[PDB]
Structures are given as C-alpha cells and as structure tokens.
Amino acid sequence: SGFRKMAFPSGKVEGCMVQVTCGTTTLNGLWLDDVVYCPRHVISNHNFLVQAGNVQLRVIGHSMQNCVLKLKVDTANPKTPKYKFVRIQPGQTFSVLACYNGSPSGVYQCAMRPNFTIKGSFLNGSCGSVGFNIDYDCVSFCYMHHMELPTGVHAGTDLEGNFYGPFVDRQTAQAAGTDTTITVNVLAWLYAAVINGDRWFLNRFTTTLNDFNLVAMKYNYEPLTQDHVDILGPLSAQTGIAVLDMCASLKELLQNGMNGRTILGSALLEDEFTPFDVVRQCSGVTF
Amino acid sequence: SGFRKMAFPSGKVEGCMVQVTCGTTTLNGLWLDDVVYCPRHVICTSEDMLNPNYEDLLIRKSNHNFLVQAGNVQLRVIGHSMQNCVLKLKVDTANPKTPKYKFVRIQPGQTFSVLACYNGSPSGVYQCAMRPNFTIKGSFLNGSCGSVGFNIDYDCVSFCYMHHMELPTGVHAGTDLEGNFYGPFVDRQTAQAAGTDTTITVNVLAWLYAAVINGDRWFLNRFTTTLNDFNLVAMKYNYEPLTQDHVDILGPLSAQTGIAVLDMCASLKELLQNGMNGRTILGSALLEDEFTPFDVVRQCSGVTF
Numbered sequence: 001s002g003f004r005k006m007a008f009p010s011g012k013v014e015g016c017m018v019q020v021t022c023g024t025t026t027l028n029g030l031w032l033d034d035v036v037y038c039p040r041h042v043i044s045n046h047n048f049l050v051q052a053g054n055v056q057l058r059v060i061g062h063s064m065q066n067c068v069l070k071l072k073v074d075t076a077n078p079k080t081p082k083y084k085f086v087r088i089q090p091g092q093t094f095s096v097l098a099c100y101n102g103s104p105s106g107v108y109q110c111a112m113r114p115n116f117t118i119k120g121s122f123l124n125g126s127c128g129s130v131g132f133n134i135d136y137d138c139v140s141f142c143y144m145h146h147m148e149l150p151t152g153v154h155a156g157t158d159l160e161g162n163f164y165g166p167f168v169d170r171q172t173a174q175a176a177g178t179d180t181t182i183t184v185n186v187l188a189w190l191y192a193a194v195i196n197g198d199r200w201f202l203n204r205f206t207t208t209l210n211d212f213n214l215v216a217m218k219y220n221y222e223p224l225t226q227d228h229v230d231i232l233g234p235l236s237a238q239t240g241i242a243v244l245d246m247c248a249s250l251k252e253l254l255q256n257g258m259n260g261r262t263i264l265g266s267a268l269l270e271d272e273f274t275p276f277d278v279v280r281q282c283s284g285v286t287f
Numbered sequence: 288s289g290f291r292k293m294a295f296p297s298g299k300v301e302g303c304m305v306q307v308t309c310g311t312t313t314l315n316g317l318w319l320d321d322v323v324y325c326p327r328h329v330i331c332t333s334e335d336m337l338n339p340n341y342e343d344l345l346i347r348k349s350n351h352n353f354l355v356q357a358g359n360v361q362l363r364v365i366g367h368s369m370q371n372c373v374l375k376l377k378v379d380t381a382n383p384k385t386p387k388y389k390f391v392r393i394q395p396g397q398t399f400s401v402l403a404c405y406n407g408s409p410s411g412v413y414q415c416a417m418r419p420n421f422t423i424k425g426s427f428l429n430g431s432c433g434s435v436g437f438n439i440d441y442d443c444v445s446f447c448y449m450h451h452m453e454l455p456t457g458v459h460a461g462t463d464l465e466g467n468f469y470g471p472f473v474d475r476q477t478a479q480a481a482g483t484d485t486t487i488t489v490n491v492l493a494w495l496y497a498a499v500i501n502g503d504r505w506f507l508n509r510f511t512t513t514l515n516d517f518n519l520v521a522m523k524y525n526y527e528p529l530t531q532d533h534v535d536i537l538g539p540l541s542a543q544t545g546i547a548v549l550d551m552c553a554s555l556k557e558l559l560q561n562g563m564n565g566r567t568i569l570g571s572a573l574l575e576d577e578f579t580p581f582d583v584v585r586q587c588s589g590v591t592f
C-alpha cells in the first residue's frame with residue numbers, strides 16, 4: 001500500500017555528473033565515455049575547465065550539436081552505464097537529478113507538460129542537470145536543463161540539443177503557452193486510487209469518447225485519444241472499471257469538484273503519473 | 288524558483304543493497320563494511336509472526352542457513368547476532384562501495400528519503416516524513432522489508448529507518464538501524480493500530496515561509512497571535528502543538544522574510560478557518576507538512592522574491 005511520486009534510483013546518473021567552467025560561467029555536464037555534454041550557453045580546448053570530483057579532466061576537442069556543446073575529454077568515464085538518448089513526448093514522466101557545481105543535490109520525478117515546460121525545482125547553477133528513465137539496466141537520457149521562464153517554470157533540450165517547446169537559448173521575451181492537464185495520466189492515477197482502496201468517486205455511469213472530449217476541452221484537459229484508451233486497457237482489466245466508465249467519474253469530478261474529499265491524499269486531480277508508472281509502482285519493478 | 292518534494296540522490300545507498308534469504312523468506316539487507324543489517328523477522332515463518340520467540344528461532348540457526356546475495360555474487364556469512372529487532376550478519380567481504388555513514392534515530396516531523404527495494408534490487412526513491420504517530424505513509428509492497436530511510440547532508444549518509452511492516456490502514460512501521468522501533472509497535476502480527484495522526488505544524492509553517500520566498504503572500508493577514516491561542520485553535524484541526532523550540536527553529540526564515548513566527552501562525556489560523564477558496568500555495572490545494580524548516584533553507588534561494 002501507499003502511493004508516492006517516485007523517482008528512479010539516481011546512482012547510474014550520479015557517476016556521470018561533472019562541473020564545466022568557461023570563463024565566468026559554471027554549470028553541469030554529463031560525462032559519458034570520452035564526451036562531456038552540457039548546454040552551449042556555457043560559452044580553445046584549455047578554455048573549458050572540466051572537474052570530475054576532485055580530478056581535473058583534459059579537454060582535447062569540442063563541437064556543437066544544436067543547443068548542446070560536446071567536449072571531447074582525454075579520459076573515458078569508467079562509471080559510464082549502458083545508455084541511450086531518447087526524445088520524450090508531452091505527458092511522459094522522468095526523474096531529474098538536480099546538480100550544482102557538478103555535485104548532485106536532489107532527485108525528483110516530474111512530467112513534460114503539454115506546453116513543453118517542466119515544473120521543476122531549479123536554482124542558478126542547476127543548468128546541465130538531466131532528466132532520465134531506467135528500463136532494466138539501460139539509462140535513457142531525455143532532458144538537459146537550460147533555463148527558467150518568467151513564471152517559474154523550466155525549459156530544456158533532449159541530449160541531442162533540440163529544445164522541447166518553442167524556446168530559444170537566450171535572454172529574450174519568452175513565455176510558456178497556456179498549459180493543459182494530462183488526461184490519460186489523471187485517469188491512470190484514478191485507477192491507482194481504486195487499487196489502493198479509494199472508490200468514493202466511482203459511479204454506475206459510462207460515457208462516449210466524443211462526449212467526454214467535449215467536457216475535457218471545456219476544463220483545459222488534453223483530448224483523450226483511442227491510443228490513451230488502449231494504453232489504459234491493463235488497468236481497466238485489473239480493476240474491472242472500463243476506461244469510458246472511469247471517464248464518467250472524471251466528468252463528475254470536473255463538473256462538481258471533490259466536496260471536501262481527497263484521492264490518494266490529494267485535493268487536486270494529479271496528472272504526473274503515466275499508466276506505466278502506475279503499473280510499475282503497483283508491481284515492484286526493480287533496477 | 289519552484290518547490291518540489293525532493294529526495295536525496297540514492298547512489299551511495301544503492302551500492303549497499305543486498306538480498307537476504309532464510310528458508311522461504313526473502314527480503315533486503317544493508318551491507319556496510321563486513322556487516323549486513325536486515326529485519327530479524329527474516330528468520331520467521333508466517334505462522335511464527337503471531338507470537339515469535341526470536342531468541343529461540345535464532346539459536347536454531349547456523350551461518351550457512353542465511354543466504355546473502357550482492358548483485359550476482361554470493362556473500363559468505365561468518366557470524367550472526369541480534370540487536371533489538373535487527374539481525375546483523377557478519378560476512379567475509381567488506382563492501383568496497385561503503386560510503387561514509389552514521390546511524391541516527393530521528394524524531395517525528397523529521398523527513399528522509401526512502402530507497403524502496405525488492406530482492407536486493409532498488410526500484411524507486413521517494414521523500415517522506417516520520418509522522419507524529421511514528422508511522423510513515425510510504426509506498427511499500429510485500430518484499431520491500433529491509434528497505435531503508437536516509438539523509439545525505441554533505442558526503443555522509445545518515446541511516447535513520449529500516450522498513451519492517453505495514454499496518455491495517457496502509458501505513459508503515461519500522462526501526463532505526465540499531466533495531467529500536469519508532470512507535471509503540473512490535474514485529475509481531477498482533478492487533479496493532481496507528482494512533483490518531485496529526486499535522487506537523489512546524490513543517491506547515493516552514494512551507495508557508497517557502498511560499499513567501501517564492502513570491503506568494505495572498506494568505507498573510509494583519510494579525511498576530513499568542514503562542515497559547517495558536518495552539519488552542521490548531522489542536523481543534525488535529526495539528527501538533529507548536530512549542531518554543533519550533534518557534535526558535537523558525538527564526539532564520541522569519542528574519543529572511545520579515546514575517547514574525549507568531550504573525551505566520553495567525554496566517555495559518557486563518558487558512559484553517561477559511562480553507563483555500565480555489566487558490567493554491569506552491570501548486571498545492573492542501574497545507575503541506577513534509578518539508579522541515581531545514582529542508583526549506585536547503586531547497587529555497589537565500590533571496591526572497
């Protein structure tokens with residue numbers, strides 16, 4: 001029992017965090033094999049100072065790929081895990097290892113919002129902190145922190161330097177678009193509440209995907225697609241509540257509220273747990 | 288900017304997780320130097336749990352009855368002893384990944400990170416607090432026994448909790464690393480219930496100061512309160528009494544934001560009275576109590592917005 005916002009164990013990523021200094025700028029880098037990846041806004045080889053723990057690494061080459069700077073170093077990281085660079089879609093979740101001066105200070109779980117921002121917890125010096133998922137023993141790097149927007153939200157790139165969202169890496173008038181709730185994730189979290197014995201919000205009603213999408217559009221909820229319904233199949237079979245039956249519960253929570261009640265200790269409808277996160281936490285998958 | 292429930296990086300603890308098997312029972316152990324620490328109920332069967340005599344069960348065991356697995360490597364047990372509700376298995380190999388560490392016993396209201404494990408393999412990390420009723424609202428399934436709670440201030444890992452059991456309400460109970468339970472609990476399957484839980488007042492206050500640091504002041508009012516009047520009201524909402532120690536501990540945050548602790552207490556009094564009215568504080572519609580004054584100073588900036 002219990003439902004927590006759980007992050008992946010960060011150990012395989014901690015062994016890759018280094019400090020990168022170029023002139024007056026100091027931020028974080030990801031050391032994989034003989035390359036250090038970091039935001040290009042950190043800007044010859046000796047101008048780049050790279051520190052891995054107490055050891056100074058020697059930069060022997062440099063190149064740029066989109067908004068990421070790649071510093072070829074002389075030493076391959078002996079702690080390099082099995083890894084892949086993956087680009088995630090909005091709604092997908094990941095763990096963030098927040099670092100300052102190449103030293104990890106915290107780990108949290110979050111989701112890529114539909115407006116491509118992340119509601120993170122970052123201070124000055126956190127640039128170059130990374131987002132990741134673990135699938136068996138392979139680390140899938142999906143995010144590198146670049147900046148904070150005027151509303152306190154964060155923007156960054158995949159590990160190939162491509163920004164998530166209509167953002168650029170520079171000081172200019174940039175604003176996060178109007179955000180929406182990740183519907184498939186709220187539904188998954190309602191199924192996790194049913195698994196943990198919270199059924200007060202269940203009703204005898206069902207709905208059509210068309211009728212529900214008209215309700216979702218009215219409450220700034222992302223449209224629910226047939227793919228989302230198919231993805232919720234296992235949770236529907238485990239609890240005995242059809243996806244459109246759970247959609248009728250969500251419609252009633254949106255039109256009437258919680259009425260002093262909570263779901264999994266929350267008075268808001270939680271949208272940062274994917275259908276896969278719910279299955280993984282309610283099964284004990286290890287890494 | 289931003290405020291998240293953040294856990295400590297778990298890498299130093301991952302390198303200590305092992306699997307301990309005694310007969311049919313399989314749970315997690317903490318491998319530090321040449322000792323593996325795990326719940327003593329690993330020597331029990333399900334039947335044994337009603338009234339276990341651990342001394343009688345342990346005396347019938349030998350070293351080779353305890354199987355310890357560290358990754359793909361089998362560790363050899365060369366000795367065993369019991370300290371309160373923890374079993375200590377002396378092994379023939381010191382853990383090369385042993386970090387700098389201490390065993391600390393925490394008080395209610397204190398927070399810590401939990402590395403949840405199954406079969407000696409870590410699966411997730413989360414942040415939580417020791418509730419005033421000594422339970423933890425964790426996320427544990429069968430096989431998670433022996434998972435540990437910790438804080439990592441500087442490079443030293445302070446181990447404060449080892450998971451032992453789930454109570455009938457879905458909450459969890461465990462011990463410090465010396466085997467002493469937190470709360471009036473026993474490692475027996477007896478009628479045990481968590482006491483009535485309360486909100487950690489000093490933590491809610493710290494979180495209100497964190498909201499002021501991040502630029503939110505809608506909840507503040509022009510009133511102050513006496514400490515006693517605050518407690519008379521807060522006790523009616525099932526809030527823990529606020530002591531002079533709590534007020535002293537909130538001193539730095541009070542000086543940083545310019546809001547006296549008893550003025551922040553008046554805002555809390557009013558928040559309990561009125562509710563939120565469709566508003567949120569740091570993206571939350573409830574009053575959050577799992578961030579200590581120390582956590583707020585660590586996560587939030589030194590400059591108030």
Ligand SMILES: N#CC1(CS(=O)(=O)N2Cc3ccc(Cl)cc3[C@@]3(CCN(c4cncc5ccccc45)C3=O)C2)CC1
Pocket residue numbers: 001328336427428429430431432451452453454455456473474475476477
């Ligand atoms: N109410 C209740 C429960 C507990 S029990 O009655 O099955 N149980 C008695 C018991 C008594 C004392 C001790 Cl020290 C340990 C144990 C056990 C050992 C494993 N465990 C667990 C531990 N953690 C999470 C868990 C989740 C789900 C099933 C077990 C879990 C226990 O609680 C077993 C069903 C959840």
Ligand SMILES: [Cl-]
Pocket residue numbers: 392393394397
């Ligand atoms: Cl403490």
